[PDB]
Write an enzyme that holds these catalytic residues in place. Structure first.
Site: not given
Ligand code: FCO
Ligand code: NI
Ligand code: SF4
Ligand code: SF4
Ligand code: SF4
Ligand code: SF4
Ligand code: FCO
Ligand code: F3S
Ligand code: F3S
Ligand code: MG
Ligand code: MG
Ligand code: MG
Ligand code: MG
Ligand code: MG
Ligand code: NI
Lengths: 551, 269, 269, 551
Positions: D13, D60, D63, D67, D478, D501, D545, D548
């Protein structure tokens, strides 16, 4: 002789009783009896012609769609309405997708347990079972792992001691001929069939508004609003969704149902030599594609004394020879008027007086075509297509025969199709050819819309005086269907349905001639008269629907 | 591999559409219903056994599971002429139903025919068809109307009986409120069009082709209780009669479906 | 085995949710999209190639399919500080987009971010994020807003281009009328409850638990164009935010989503 | 010696650049760079705390859910709200089902084309391929027929000359080690994965109102109205529908994804000896099941210097040891304030000045835990569970190892898990264990509703004066996620997201210490510097990601 009764016959639609006289283990005489009546013809009378289809669709929910479509065709016939071509495409897609679900369910959920022994399936080697199908099918769900999973589901059910729909089945009957491995194959396919038929009915639902019992028809066309650019109507997104389900049907039909049909025939070759019900066959053309209620994709016709070479083509639903030939008698039925009646002049006057072998014994009427008994449905339909020299039908039959030949070393001739297995083969051929109908009519609809034609409905006018008559034909899953409407002073003054299972299941007629079910049973061996599986095998090949037969 | 709750299904004057609804179900699918959810101890459309064998299955189940099974009936029950308009194994279906009802833990009328007579009892009513409730005056019949209902209106009723040990909440027609508690018109996505006077006048007209309200085509939403606009049908999304372009006919509702013409206007509260 | 229509997909300030919408699609599924419907000539989320090899793919495809490809952009395009808030292969994404736009047969802004700036341009707009139409003033950009839209709002737009050789009909914001032609509140199934003054006041309250109208929770349906109440989401039936119990937030509509509070009331027309 | 850039890194991503110095055919030094910023922390500032989650969910869409959940948990932390247990069950089901979709797509659509050569699959024997999986898998879609159909789709794509997303892939690269048969297996599973992930997201959709981007949360619980008897709300029919999808996930996860993980390890065993990113690991406990935001189904903890035996458990999302350890630096990031900042006091002031190897080279911040670099995500998660002695995790790892043993005759020790393949394994183990989370929480919800609890939401109050600080922890696909909200005078005065990430991808830190991505690449053999597949193999293992990482 010995006298047996099979009541209820299960794994059909509706309420059927079959009686047989047995001489030295062979059926000598049989009686078919529809044991439930509603009077749907009388219920629909004295209403606005536009209302009929919603009511008479409820003649049957297995063959849902069919009576709805025949009823609107009948009113359109009476009123002289030409249906918009977009309405025909939509009607056609519904009928073809419906019939796909219908035939699949008939072969697996209704019929397979006449031929398949689940106890024997538990003894199967799943790997040997998979290997038997190498070079015979390219289906992706024939692995030993699939078959083991299915075997374990049966094992678990038997172990529970709650066999349910499988309780007291004909396990170990002497007429069960499949090896364990093929029994397991068939059970695996029975379960997989349920997903395919579900996809077929998703097609139906997206055009019909639901199924069972579609709700998108009208006298004058359909209620679907075609607008590629409209929110909440039949737009491109909706059509794409329809197509996604159309495309999911073919693989199972071709690589499973078609193949199993050949496999069953290969293990039951004596069933090519019994279960002949008639020497005359009738089908109507189906799937109109012009703007004038014709140009059918499938041909119709009339075969006499099994002679395909001299059959009579039927290319129009207004064919006067077809119309004038159809009569029904109630001599051996529980109605009052017994002489053959043309359906526009039909009566349905109940006169129940109990069962008599030589008198009245059924709620089904006895239809004739110019005085003869006739079989309708997939055997008729296939034979008429072969007589027409339809290459698609020849080719499809040839594919079934090629599998059968690979398994047995033998071919099949047309003479052998006049049988219980021939009837099953005709139904499979139909299901296969219907997948091309679906592709053809979806493409036709997209093309036509692209040309700027969004029309779907021609509003009828119904004269408030005068008396006029219409007939709507339809080639249903179980054969030729006709609804006959008489309108007088703007309302229905007569309504008569002559339904395919009426033709096949009807009792002895005005001349005491024997109809297809009864005739088909003469000669049937019955190993165990307490458990007459052999009788039910032949009866089920006709795909009985007794809500249809009797209405 | 536990024991599963038993079900006995008897069809009277039925078109089979109510059984067929199960073949469209997804939660559960019919195969999971019969292998996992219940033990379908009698159902003539699917059972391997026929004739004397299937009648033995019924008797054995009525005994083994006395006080425990759900009895389901589709189709109307014809009383005219001493029951002879529906005879199975040589006896009036009303007698089979009354017998099976004696030992039932719960009794369900699936479909408008068994819930209130439905199409088979319409017009002149040739066979003196009546409802399941009418033939079982001493019992509480759970009515799941529609022609046929969405199958999950039935399946979730059965699941509530199984999972939580009693029927779902019912209205004063003994219909489950989760499925029949509101008029279709009081939860219809075309109500804005109704309110604005935006109406289809004929199929294929410009308003129709914009998804406007179908009241003037005879929509019976204003006088029919159901969940057709929300639950809809077939679990594909967006599929019910009105969304496809055709008015509700009132098939759920006694005195509407099979009585009023398609194009007859509904009364609005 | 015929040639398939080429598509170039470029992500700017994207969250990837617009690409992810494709993984929920059913008509076509993403696997049938990329194998049967189109040739996806560039898409950084799924491409085997990376780095120099994938930039090779892009340049090859822009030349090979000049005048023929559909260009798709998700995310906003940041103009602040000369483009440096989104740099791919050492160059501002606005330059990659302008280059691809030169040879496009059709240009689609998928999602609210590319359609009108979306969440990335909200508040103080830290990066000077703008829409795809803003960076391509001489081109007709087809806007498919939502955060993300139902993937079929995009897929049936592409299908219309392929099948009939032109875009679908568009409104005055260049949004396809089949998906964005009507206010959600002008085709919402809870309109009857709005009309009767039957309103949820808090999540979990009695009205909420009977599926009443969510206006007083902040529903933006009255000022948001979309197909969320009809087409809904995920093709399972009955799934959109309001049906699940939460107001529309106006994510499709500039000046509503990401501007107004969840519980701020909409203006009603 | 030479310097390469990989930009863009695809099959992640977002927007990532990786640079590497290569010396004597091995990476000697690496830089990770997030090349896109939006300022999501600034966009959400000055708003009502209740609005944050709908805005920051858009950090994101891969994912998605995460969030949104972290944001409501942060506001609930600040406000001292105890979430209703039914809301916890619903949040949990969503997170688990989402993560199932997420991990499957990572292994197949994002990562497999690092290890799998589609050209080589065209040379496979489908029957040999199927035979290779006997006694390794019971999956029902590993037949030769399935594999032949898949091979023919590849054949057709290649024949078309339009390879699209497969064009200019690393076909024939010397680091591609699978036999033709295993390539073909993987591609078949790649396509099959898409169905399983779609089913996982159907679970998410039925509770979230759609996906991507759920819309059923609230500060104070959820917006789902629980009423078993209610029309149009979360009733028993809807719950049964959810369950029908939950039940469809297990077989693919257990019989395909789990097995493929072992198969890739078996053919690539050197990748157990490289790609170590850190010696410290962090995870947070997840799936709370009590009425007080605790009693997690999965444990959390901190591992220092790879010592499982002396790890520190984390059992609470209010753990002050966890809270006080976390800081972020921008010394080598394009922000103005460079000293380590606790997130409640964090700033995000952009200060782009171009790339410098020794200066600023990323939009990603550099997180530390008590001054140390830490790896988060599935490897951390698994190792913490192993340290906790969680039998479910031991047992699931052992299943993977047993398949590896059967294929190779070798075992795997915990030391070998600190590697590119170990990371992948941790992810697979997570996905497997999440299926029991789904069954557990579905059952818990049904049971709780049955006790008469239909509560879902506690309305918050937010004081108009005072300053309140909250933190919402979540164990994302992640790794450990945290949202940090400061409320002052009723509105958000600071918002800082520290995303998994960020931990892994962040650049050199205040002390110029190297973070996981950059560390992991040291020692990577690169056969062809123009086509650095080996670098991308290790980077993908972390499941980057960058929307992210940077936000
Ligand atoms: N899994 C995911 Fe996105 C990332 N890095 C978040 O939190
Ligand atoms: Ni993400
Ligand atoms: S309710 Fe409708 S579908 Fe069910 S038996 Fe009666 S007519 Fe048939
Ligand atoms: S009349 Fe029918 S279509 Fe119109 S709003 Fe009412 S229920 Fe909906
Ligand atoms: S429109 Fe929404 S889902 Fe699409 S890129 Fe923007 S934030 Fe993501
Ligand atoms: S305010 Fe929202 S929930 Fe209420 S009727 Fe309008 S769109 Fe529907
Ligand atoms: N097919 C079908 Fe039903 C019967 N017989 C009708 O028509
Ligand atoms: S006709 Fe029946 S199926 Fe529903 S839409 Fe009306 S109650
Ligand atoms: S928030 Fe968006 S997804 Fe639809 S329901 Fe409202 S426009
Ligand atoms: Mg008749
Ligand atoms: Mg209840
Ligand atoms: Mg157009
Ligand atoms: Mg409260
Ligand atoms: Mg941050
Ligand atoms: Ni029928």
């Amino acid at each position: 002789s010995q006298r047996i009764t099979i009541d209820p016959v299960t794994r059909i639609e509706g309420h059927l009783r079959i009686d047989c006289e047995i001489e030295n283990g062979v059926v000598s005489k049989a009686w078919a009896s529809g044991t439930m009546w509603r009077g749907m013809e009388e219920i629909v009378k004295n209403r606005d012609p536009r209302d009929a289809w919603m009511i008479v669709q409820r003649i049957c929910g297995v063959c849902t769609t069919t009576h709805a479509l025949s009823s609107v065709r009948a009113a359109e016939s009476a009123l002289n309405i030409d249906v918009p071509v977009n309405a025909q495409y939509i009607r056609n897609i519904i009928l073809a997708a419906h019939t796909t679900h219908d035939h699949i369910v008939h072969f697996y959920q209704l019929s397979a347990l006449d031929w398949v022994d689940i106890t024997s399936a538990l003894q199967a080697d799943p790997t040997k079972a998979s290997e038997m199908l190498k070079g015979v099918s390219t289906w992706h769900l024939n692995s030993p792992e699939e078959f083991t999973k299915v075997q374990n589901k049966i094992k678990d059910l038997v172990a529970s001691g709650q066999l349910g729909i499988f309780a007291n089945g004909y396990w170990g009957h002497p007429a069960m001929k499949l090896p364990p491995e093929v029994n397991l194959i068939a059970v695996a396919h029975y379960l997989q069939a349920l997903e395919c038929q579900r996809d077929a009915n998703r097609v139906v639902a997206l055009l019909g508004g639901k199924t069972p019992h579609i709700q998108n028809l009208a006298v004058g066309g359909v209620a679907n609003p075609i607008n590629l650019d409209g929110l909440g109507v039949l737009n491109l997104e909706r059509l794409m969704y329809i197509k996604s389900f159309i495309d999911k049907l073919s693989d199972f039909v071709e690589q499973v149902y078609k193949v199993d049909t050949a496999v069953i025939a290969a293990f039951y070759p004596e069933w090519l030599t019994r279960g002949k019900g008639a020497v005359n066959y009738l089908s109507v053309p189906e799937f109109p594609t012009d703007s004038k209620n014709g140009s059918f994709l499938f041909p119709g016709g009339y075969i006499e004394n099994a002679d395909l070479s001299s059959y009579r083509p039927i290319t129009s639903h207004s064919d006067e020879y077809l119309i004038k030939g159809i009569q029904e008698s109630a001599k051996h039925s529980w109605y009052k008027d017994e002489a053959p009646q043309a359906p526009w002049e039909g009566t349905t006057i109940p006169a129940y007086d109990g069962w008599s072998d030589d008198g009245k014994y059924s709620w089904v009427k006895s239809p004739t075509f110019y005085g003869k008994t006739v079989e309708v449905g997939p055997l008729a339909n296939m034979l008429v297509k072969l007589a027409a020299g339809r290459e698609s039908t020849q080719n499809k039959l040839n594919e079934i025969v090629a599998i059968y030949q690979k398994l047995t070393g033998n071919t099949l001739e047309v003479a052998q199709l006049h049988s219980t297995l021939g009837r099953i083969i005709g139904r499979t051929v139909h299901c296969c050819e219907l997948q091309d109908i679906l592709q053809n009519q979806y493409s036709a609809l997209i093309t036509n819309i692209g040309k700027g034609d969004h029309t779907t409905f021609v509003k009828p006018n119904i004269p408030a005086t005068g008396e006029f008559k219409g007939v709507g034909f339809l080639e249903a899953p179980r054969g030729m269907l006709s609804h006959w409407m008489v309108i007088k002073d703007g309302i229905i003054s007569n309504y008569q349905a002559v339904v395919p299972s009426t033709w096949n299941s009807g009792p002895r007629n005005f001349n005491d001639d024997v109809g297809p079910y009864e005739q088909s049973l003469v000669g049937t061996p019955v190993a165990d008269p307490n458990k007459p599986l052999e009788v039910v095998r032949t009866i089920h090949s006709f795909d009985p629907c007794m809500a249809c037969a009797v209405h | 591999n536990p024991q599963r709750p038993p079900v006995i299904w008897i069809g009277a004057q039925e078109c089979t559409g109510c059984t067929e609804s199960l073949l469209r179900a997804t939660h559960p699918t019919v195969e999971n219903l019969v292998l996992e959810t219940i033990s379908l101890e009698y159902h003539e459309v699917l059972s391997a056994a026929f004739g004397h064998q299937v009648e033995e299955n019924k008797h054995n189940a009525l005994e083994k599971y006395k006080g425990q099974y759900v009895l389901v009936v589709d189709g109307s029950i014809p009383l005219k002429d001493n029951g002879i308009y529906c005879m199975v194994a040589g006896e009036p279906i009303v007698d089979h139903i009354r017998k099976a009802a004696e030992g039932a833990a719960a009794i369900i009328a699936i479909g408008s025919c068994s819930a209130w007579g439905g199409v088979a009892a319409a017009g002149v009513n040739p066979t003196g068809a009546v409802s399941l409730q009418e033939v079982l005056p001493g019992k509480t019949v759970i009515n799941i109307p529609g022609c046929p209902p969405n199958p999950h209106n039935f399946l979730a009723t059965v699941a509530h009986i199984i999972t939580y040990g009693k029927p779902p909440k019912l209205d004063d027609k003994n219909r489950p409120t989760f499925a029949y508690g509101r008029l279709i018109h009081e939860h219809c996505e075309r109500r804005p069009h109704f309110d604005a006077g935006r109406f289809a006048k004929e199929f294929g007209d410009e308003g129709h082709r914009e998804g406007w309200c179908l009241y003037h085509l005879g929509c019976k939403g204003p006088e029919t209780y159901g969940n057709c606009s929300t639950l809809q049908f077939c679990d594909v999304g967006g599929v019910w009669p009105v969304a496809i372009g055709h008015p509700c006919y009132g098939c759920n509702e006694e005195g509407i479906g099979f009585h009023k013409g398609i194009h007859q206007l509904a009364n609005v509260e």
